[model samples]
Target: KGVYAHYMLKEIHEQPAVMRRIIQEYQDAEGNLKIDQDIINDVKEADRIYVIAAGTSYHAGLVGKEFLEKWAGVPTEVHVASEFVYNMPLLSEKPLFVYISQSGETADSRAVLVETNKLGHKSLTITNVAGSTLSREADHTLLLHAGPEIAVASTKAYTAQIAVLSILSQIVAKEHEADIDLLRELAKVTTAIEAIVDDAPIMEQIATDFLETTRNAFFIGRTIDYNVSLEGALKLKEISYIQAEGFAGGELKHGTIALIEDGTPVVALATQENVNLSIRGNVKEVVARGAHPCIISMEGLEKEGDTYVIPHVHELLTPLVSVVALQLISYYAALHRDLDVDK
Candidate 1:
């Protein structure tokens, strides 16, 4: 579109507009939020939903699972595209296959899409590239409208996927008669995200603090935040080339703690309000182990020494806003390391 110089930069700036477009699609003539009627029927009729993808798309699928289960009340499973094809699960006839990809030409995802089609299962592809292989082959397509992603490392595409998945959740929720207020709350969360996007100074300071010193890091969270942590780690590792791992906050005590020592960086996400205290406790545990803790909590859930406190949003929707901070952190981290941002 020539709106920005690089795909990565263009995609990052496209988020606010792209998010608004997604929201408008779900809002009908009467101003009520809803999803496509056919998609709703698919959710209602399905026995289980299988989401398959690889790389950044796989991380988006993980977050999609959380949105589906929490808001839509659908039991969903997310699998790596390659693994899903070779180790196919015993399936029910009423399964919906959701294949997510930015390029839509990912070999692993295409293979699974083909296999699902052969099995007579309904498949839908959420991808950025329209008319690409997966989109052409799948039963249906939801375009990400993230434009061209030039960077090998994805940023805006991830958020665009999450935005569409959030709409998918609301669609299902409306069909199942889940709380209407909750749906509205989810929609309202976008405003909070806009506010955070404008808060660039805070992100810059966070980038300054840990970008240069850290060669490796760990991201820990529980429940939904755990999913967000996975994406956070990916953003860092993709561009910054840091050896980063995302762990379920509780899993720290199991074996990951062994890797924590003086000067080690730990990025803890405490955006899920339900698990805020427990995640904070984990931060204390890591700090006691001599790990330098950079806690990224929501505004109201702030703890002492939180490296960053993102503006509050719906707990289930925090990833949309929290990820912006992580993206900037990774951007600065890579710049400081003199690494390629497009990697």
Candidate 2:
């Protein structure tokens, strides 16, 4: 670990290398993807996989569920660490637990890890910090290699988790003879992440404009983008201290639309190409209700008055790249507000 002028800046630059390392762990000399043999065996033996995580890590787990079910043919459930611990589910005898944490010292995650271990469940922990409590206690640990993250709001660690999860998905897919296309699609995620990183100036401008006038923010998307929106909003709230809410795009009309008054800031993610049009329609709906819509859609999915267009990538895999733009936005928003990054 090394000190830098700023933790967030340092972590932001570390992403490409961290992502490369994650890909390397899953690739063999011949470039064939391979997961740990024991982890594969655990998956094969399990009737279900339960992922427990908190904060940004939980968002990655949500995306991981998509990867697992789509590629591994495995039924998967993602649960918040605190909620899972307090409202315990009926344990399946062959349940496999995947715990994700960057700090590994998160109180809720550690508690859940202990409880899962007591149940004799097979556990895998994905963590950025080596030798963390969660890493040491879990049956297996996947290091993110994101280096030391000093910023309270996580960036590289989040991407690192997604990168590793992508590899895990491909390996599981190959083992289960799942669609080869899924693996092929993932090859584009890293480059997409870099493209988003290159778009930092656009995100910074958006953040500066919105944060200067808004006290609250809303994020909405459908499917995987909905999950990414949740993380995006969380990032905003975490660092900017703005009241932010993330909603499923379809759910807006039900009640959340009432909050879309004049001058309200709404960040709409339309990265999932399958739902791109519908999400744009949602944006129109919100804007019609007087909300300021900042649409962040994948390339070629842009609509009139859309605020920003992130580079295109595989739809199921776009979250890894899309979330980075949101992170930069939040960072710049906080900076615009003169908020302490340490907070």
Candidate 3:
């Protein structure tokens, strides 16, 4: 059960509710999110936040920054662990480094932790591994637990990291008196994800429809959607061998729009209310350029011509909910291509 090797094979048998849940998945469902006073105190000590990691965990760090900024009114930034190690950014006066990793053995993350300590700054490692290097090296630890992991594609860990981060953001918000029901929101998010997972055959066909013959694709969105664009692209590229890029919707006009040829697949997310129409306008411009539009929108903001409309959850938690759709799309994209499904 601890092995990552055959984990996906075991979980695919789940009839949804009985899935081998991440440690916080159950707690999040039952409205049981508890963050330590010590953890909040360390987070509160920082004037600005920097989240560090690589790959899927890096994307998790991005979402963590997304939540903290939007909910807690805190300025935050995300950096790839590898890049931050070699070219560390200028730090905030009271900087807090949030290191996110699934293995906690990521060497790049360890290097950043060492450098952070040397500079006498606070660091937090949010990871699944209990006693791995980053955990021992960082100033504090938050376990993303019960997963030594599922697919090399990393579906479960992605979900857990956001859920865990959302809870922490909530804790910090409470400490600062910014109001929101992160628990209620996450419960809706988990249910919405369950429904999408049960309907996996949907993406199975969507992959064959839009991506079966394509070698390259794009995922675009605005604001937080831009953050998710990065994740959607990475997951598709991971298993399917498709050349994929995730970018801000507004950025397409600069140069990426030239790559849009007839029948090229483009996936767009429009979950944030503020950018709903603007991101859609970006889609129409690409459609005019002859790109195949696969628009994923939240139920409220959905347009008549949209491809898939994700069930609505709390606005702040949309990144957590909408991402499940992207994961399923990539899984089936790889499946139809006959690549190893979860390498």
State the number of backbone clashes in model 3.
0
Q: What is the C-alpha lDDT profile of model 2 across 1-343, one tens digit per residue?
A: 5574457856776676677777676667877777778877777678889999888898889988987888777789999988999999897778989989887888998999898888888898888778999889988887787777878888888888887776776677777655555435555666777776777788889987777778899999999999999999999899888999899999998888887788899899987768888988888899898988788887888777778787777767788888888888988888887888755
68-94, model 1: which lDDT tens digit per residue? 888788789999988888999898768
TM-score of each: 0.92, 0.93, 0.91
Model 1: residue 140 alpha-carbon error in angstroms:
1.9
Higher lDDT: candidate 1 or 2?
2
Question: What is the RMSD of candidate 3?
Answer: 3.2
Off by over 4 Å in 1: 1-7, 180-187
The backbone clash count of each candidate, in order, is 0, 0, 0
Tens digits of per-residue lDDT for model 3, 1-343? 4542234533432312222243345354455556667888988767999998888888877877877887666789988878888998787899999888888888888888899999999988888888999888887888875455656877667777887887788777777744656656666776787777776778777887899989899999898788888998998888888999999998998889999999999999999999999999998999999999999899889989888888987776787767777877887787776777656
Looking at model 2, the pairs that clash are none
> Weakest 10 consecutive residues, lDDT, candidate 2?
178-187
Q: Compare candidates 1 and 3 on lDDT and give the better one.
A: 1
Assess candidate 2 and give its lDDT: 0.82
* Global fold similarity of model 3 (TM-score): 0.91
Give per-residue lDDT, candidate 2, residue 158.
84
User: Which portions of model 3 miss their true places by more than 4 Å?
Assistant: 1-32
The number of residue pairs in model 2 that clash at the backbone is 0
lDDT of 1 at 95: 91
